[PDB]
Structures are given as C-alpha cells and as structure tokens.
Design an enzyme around this catalytic site. Structure first.
Site, short mmCIF file in Angstrom:
data_model
loop_
_atom_site.label_atom_id
_atom_site.label_comp_id
_atom_site.label_asym_id
_atom_site.label_seq_id
_atom_site.Cartn_x
_atom_site.Cartn_y
_atom_site.Cartn_z
NE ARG A 172 -4.29 1.89 1.82
CZ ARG A 172 -4.87 3.09 2.82
NH1 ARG A 172 -4.26 3.28 3.14
NH2 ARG A 172 -5.94 3.41 1.91
CD1 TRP A 211 -11.89 -6.42 0.33
CD2 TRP A 211 -9.71 -6.12 1.92
NE1 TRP A 211 -11.68 -5.11 0.59
CE2 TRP A 211 -9.98 -4.88 1.11
CE3 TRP A 211 -8.10 -6.78 2.35
CZ2 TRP A 211 -9.55 -3.63 1.25
CZ3 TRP A 211 -7.58 -4.85 2.76
CH2 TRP A 211 -8.42 -3.55 1.95
CG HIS A 271 -1.96 4.94 -0.59
ND1 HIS A 271 -2.59 5.53 0.32
CD2 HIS A 271 -2.51 5.03 -0.96
CE1 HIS A 271 -3.44 5.38 0.05
NE2 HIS A 271 -4.50 4.30 -0.35
C1 HEM Z 1 -10.75 2.68 -5.87
C2 HEM Z 1 -9.46 2.70 -5.51
C3 HEM Z 1 -9.19 2.12 -3.92
C4 HEM Z 1 -10.09 2.17 -2.59
C5 HEM Z 1 -10.87 3.66 -2.45
C6 HEM Z 1 -8.77 1.71 -1.56
C7 HEM Z 1 -9.03 2.04 -0.07
C8 HEM Z 1 -8.99 1.12 0.72
C9 HEM Z 1 -9.02 1.36 2.28
C10 HEM Z 1 -9.92 2.26 2.80
C11 HEM Z 1 -8.12 0.34 2.46
C12 HEM Z 1 -7.97 0.68 4.39
C13 HEM Z 1 -7.14 0.74 4.72
C14 HEM Z 1 -6.87 0.89 6.64
O1 HEM Z 1 -7.97 0.74 7.45
O2 HEM Z 1 -5.80 0.30 6.74
C15 HEM Z 1 -7.20 0.04 2.25
C16 HEM Z 1 -6.41 -1.54 2.29
C17 HEM Z 1 -5.02 -1.25 1.31
N1 HEM Z 1 -5.42 -1.44 0.05
FE1 HEM Z 1 -6.26 -0.04 -1.02
N2 HEM Z 1 -8.09 1.21 -2.12
C18 HEM Z 1 -7.89 1.25 -3.33
C19 HEM Z 1 -6.87 0.73 -4.32
C20 HEM Z 1 -5.81 -0.03 -4.30
C21 HEM Z 1 -4.87 0.18 -5.00
C22 HEM Z 1 -4.56 0.09 -6.79
C23 HEM Z 1 -3.62 -1.53 -4.59
C24 HEM Z 1 -2.77 -1.20 -5.15
C25 HEM Z 1 -2.35 -2.31 -6.55
C26 HEM Z 1 -4.29 -1.47 -3.21
C27 HEM Z 1 -3.90 -2.00 -1.99
C28 HEM Z 1 -4.24 -1.89 -0.77
C29 HEM Z 1 -3.20 -2.63 0.55
C30 HEM Z 1 -2.43 -3.45 0.12
C31 HEM Z 1 -4.08 -2.75 1.21
C32 HEM Z 1 -4.16 -3.01 2.73
C33 HEM Z 1 -2.83 -2.49 3.37
C34 HEM Z 1 -2.75 -2.89 5.53
O3 HEM Z 1 -3.66 -4.04 5.69
O4 HEM Z 1 -2.21 -2.47 5.89
N3 HEM Z 1 -5.17 -0.52 -2.95
N4 HEM Z 1 -7.35 0.31 0.61
#
Ligand code: HEM
EC number: 1.11.1.5
Length: 291
Positions: A45, A188, A49
């Site tokens: 992530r 998920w 970002h």
């Molecule tokens: C419409 C696009 C996206 C939205 C709105 C979104 C939103 C989110 C949200 C709300 C979280 C949870 C953050 C938390 O509470 O720790 C998250 C986690 C994550 N996202 Fe996204 N995301 C998007 C696209 C992506 C993309 C493009 C990638 C990478 C290729 C990505 C990789 C991740 C990963 C790996 C996590 C888990 C982080 C953890 O466990 O600490 N996301 N995302």
C-alpha cells in the site's frame, strides 16, 4: 516539468538485489506485526499511495520525488497507518543510504509482492529526491464510499483503463481494513499475506450483506468474516468491470501477468527513462537464492 531517471552513481543490479534481500529478510523476521499478518500488505500500500498522487495533466505528484518523507504528505488522512511501512524501511535506508527515497518506497512494494509468492514485477532505478515544495497537496487518493463511475473517472487521471483498474484492485486480497485507520473494518479473505486471485473469487462466490460498521459507514460483509468496500463491490455492479472480475477469478496466471504490468506502470508514471538507461531489473526471491 520533465523528470529524467538518473541512476544512483556507479550502482548496478547487484546493489539493488542486496537492498531487495535486506527488505525480504526483515519481512521474514518481523512476523508479529498486525496480528501476525506481517508487513507485506502495508508495504504494497505504501508503494501505491506514494505513486498514486500523480496527475497526467501536469506531471505533478508521482513516485519520482519521494515526497512522502515530508509532513504534508505523511500526514495526509488518506495515508493513515502507512507510517508503519515507513518505520520498517528506516533501518534499510540507514544500511543503504545511497538509494533514493522514491526508489526505496517503490522497491518495498515489489519486494513484498514477490516474497508473498506473487508475480515477478520488473523494476527500474533512477528516481531522484525533489524538495519539500514539490510535495502534492492532500486529496489526490481515492474515496472508498463511491460507485463504479467514480472509480473509472478517478483512474483516468493515472492513465489507467478498465482492465488496469480491475487488475490493480486484486491487491485487496492482502492485509485488512482497520476501523481507526479509515472507517472500515475486516479482511477481504483468508489468505491475506499470500498473493493470490482470492479477491475476485470472494467477490463472486460469497453471500454479501450491506451492513453498517461501528464507524457508521456502509460495507459489504459475509458469514465467513470477510468484507468488501463500496468501491470493491462496484466491480461486480458495473457490467464492464464484472466481465474482467470473472476473467481473473478463472485464470490465476492471467491475473498475475496483468497485475505485474499495471503495477510497474503505476510505479513508473511521470518518469522519463533515457534511451540508454539500464533495462528493468527482475530480482530473485530469497527462496530462489537459497537464503
Ligand atoms: C478505488 C481505489 C481504492 C480504494 C478506495 C482503496 C481503499 C482502501 C482502504 C479504505 C483500505 C484500508 C486502509 C486501512 O484501514 O488500513 C485499503 C487497504 C489496502 N489497499 Fe487499497 N484502495 C484502492 C486501491 C488500491 C490499489 C490500486 C492498491 C494497490 C495495487 C491497493 C492496495 C491496498 C492494500 C495492500 C491494503 C491493505 C493495507 C494493510 O493491510 O495495512 N488499494 N484500501
């Protein structure tokens, strides 16, 4: 403004494989983090970002300048929790002070995907640190409470098409949502520190219910204990996205290949590579090295 890649002086593939290896060995050692999920997901992530602030219209933001190190960007509300990935990388940067910040944040993501048994991701060096006044303002990263039309329009600014968007979203197999971090709670799926196509399978096969969480936000929940964000769920509400979701649920190798291309592209938006730059590097995993 043009951002030309500039190789760290005198460095070659072996130097960057040493940085890879140090990241990978710390990933293995520091296994307790996040109730034994480990640091893999948050490093993926972080790479996204730090790259996803890019604007194709004027070449502002992007991975090149490593601007997350400045307070306006590390304190973006959208980046809450990523400080854990930054702290992980600190002893790596201390051991290898010659690597640029943008090169280290992007390499962390590549290394995490590969060590969690994901596809190989070719990676190019040459990002150069830029000054504090080049840091992009907050608000360029996406909202989670929106529909497919939002997602599609959002990603046009990153020059991503429908296939590239659906492939990139498969990274949500990894890690979890944390209520205090954003306002959503839960994993998920079951395999959340091994890189697989589980995100697509769960979208299609679980029995989802629209519920409110303890922060008063709507999310989709299953009896298995899994969740999806409204933007995740939009991928099966929109008929164009739905076709692509079904493709990746039914072909693990295709998902791996398309993810690899889209993730490299994300990490490289905004960078001009000279005609005589080195070819992209493909790092060996620890397992492949016998380490
Ligand atoms: C419409 C696009 C996206 C939205 C709105 C979104 C939103 C989110 C949200 C709300 C979280 C949870 C953050 C938390 O509470 O720790 C998250 C986690 C994550 N996202 Fe996204 N995301 C998007 C696209 C992506 C993309 C493009 C990638 C990478 C290729 C990505 C990789 C991740 C990963 C790996 C996590 C888990 C982080 C953890 O466990 O600490 N996301 N995302």
């Amino acid at each position: 403004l043009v951002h030309v890649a500039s190789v760290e002086k005198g460095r070659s593939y072996e130097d960057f494989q040493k940085v890879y290896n140090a990241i990978a060995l710390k990933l293995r050692e520091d296994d307790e983090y996040d109730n034994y999920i480990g640091y893999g997901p948050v490093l993926v992530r972080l790479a996204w970002h730090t790259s996803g602030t890019w604007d194709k219209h004027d070449n502002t933001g992007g991975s090149y300048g490593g601007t997350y190190r400045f307070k306006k960007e590390f304190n973006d509300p959208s980046n809450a929790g990523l400080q854990n990935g930054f702290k992980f990388l600190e002893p790596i940067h201390k051991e290898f002070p010659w690597i640029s910040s943008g090169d280290l944040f992007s390499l962390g993501g590549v290394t995490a995907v590969q060590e969690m048994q994901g596809p190989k991701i070719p990676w190019r060096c040459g990002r150069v640190d830029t000054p504090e006044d080049t840091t992009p303002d907050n608000g360029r990263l996406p909202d989670a409470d929106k529909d497919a039309d939002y997602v599609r329009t959002f990603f046009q600014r990153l020059n991503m098409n429908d296939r590239e968007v659906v492939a990139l979203m498969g990274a949500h197999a990894l890690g979890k949502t944390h209520l205090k971090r954003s306002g959503y709670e839960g994993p998920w799926g079951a395999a959340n520190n091994v890189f697989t196509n589980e995100f697509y399978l769960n979208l299609l096969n679980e029995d989802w219910k629209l519920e409110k969480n303890d922060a008063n936000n709507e999310q989709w929940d299953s009896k298995s204990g899994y969740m999806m964000l409204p933007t995740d769920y939009s991928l099966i509400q929109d008929p164009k996205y739905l076709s692509i979701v079904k493709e990746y649920a039914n072909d693990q190798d295709k998902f791996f290949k398309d993810f690899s291309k889209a993730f490299e592209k994300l990490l490289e938006n905004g960078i001009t590579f000279p005609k005589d730059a080195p070819s992209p590097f493909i790092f060996k995993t620890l397992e492949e090295q016998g380490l």
